[model samples]
Target: VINTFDGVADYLQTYHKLPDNYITKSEAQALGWVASKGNLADVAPGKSIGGDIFSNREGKLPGKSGRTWREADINYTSGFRNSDRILYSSDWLIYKTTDAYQTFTKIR
Candidate 1:
């Protein structure tokens, strides 16, 4: 039978509470998301989508105004399958600001 989150969330709860980077490089990537935490927390393990977004950061693309330039998906489902636990997933930005939102320009 296929092991599933419904059968493992409680057993995985302790592990889940830990930092997203306490795992392998590929696994740590799931937690690198800029968003989706709110969505993941609101939904249960099996239901959480862990979607996220990305934008033009100063360091990544200095020429741009460093505004909300693009969106990204966290791919939590892929993380779960790879690491045997839920993490982040892919998602497009629902909103963004044309002007610089912060002083740094990038997520620090």
Candidate 2:
């Protein structure tokens, strides 16, 4: 499962795609995932949250036409999710953000 921060970045860098374990927020919710209660495991085991659009409204990441961004949880074990995430663009520009979206550093 692609859980580690670097693992996610490397996978996207190498494959230009998210792993098979990733599920969109809406999809997970449909499968009984409650973000506030941290019920992902309880509902869908071995699944990682992802696929939803990551709005670059903060302008922290690069800008370009057709460069849509997506975000995935990093090193998630249980309970409420932390601020860790990997933001990647449609053109395969991968980035790491530890303190939520306040700041970002390109990784791939």
Candidate 3:
């Protein structure tokens, strides 16, 4: 697992396993992160990006029993989190999108 944001992003894009740095949305929020503002530096400092529940309510992604999907913001240099995001499943499926969750491309 990687530590740096860039490194994690690269590894995720390169078909690498999700790094240990990724925390859930609740986890980030607990650390003082506000999705509407991206205020993480105060509490999390070097930690900003991480995995969060990605409910495929619209059935956009493949489905399976006992499977869970998580997502993380991509290319988030700081300030405010953008639409760019990466989605992945516990079973090793990965997808990416630059325009938020509107579209996705399988990465692995």
Best-fitting candidate, scored by lDDT: 2
The residue-level lDDT of candidate 1 at 74 comes to 24
lDDT of each: 0.29, 0.76, 0.66
Using TM-score as the measure, the top candidate is 2
Q: What does candidate 2's lDDT look like per residue over 21-75, in tens digits?
A: 7878888788777656778766556666887886576666887764577888887
Q: Write the per-residue lDDT of candidate 3 for residues 37-78, one digit (tens) a residue.
A: 778655555554767776576678766876677777666443
Error of 1 at 106 (Å): 18
Instruction: Sum up the clashes in candidate 2.
Output: 0
Error of 3 at 22 (Å): 2.3
Each prediction's TM-score versus the true structure:
0.19, 0.82, 0.69
lDDT of 1 by residue, 1-108 (tens): 113333222323333332331234333345452243333222224232222334544334333434432322222332232223322211211222123332222221
- Quote the RMSD, in angstroms, for model 3: 3.8
Model 1, residue 36: C-alpha shift (Å): 17
Cα RMSD, each candidate: 14.8, 2.0, 3.8
Candidate 1: how large is its RMSD? 14.8
In model 2, the worst 10-residue window by lDDT is 39-48
Superior candidate under TM-score, 1 versus 2: 2
Q: Give candidate 2 regions above 4 Å deviation.
A: 54-58
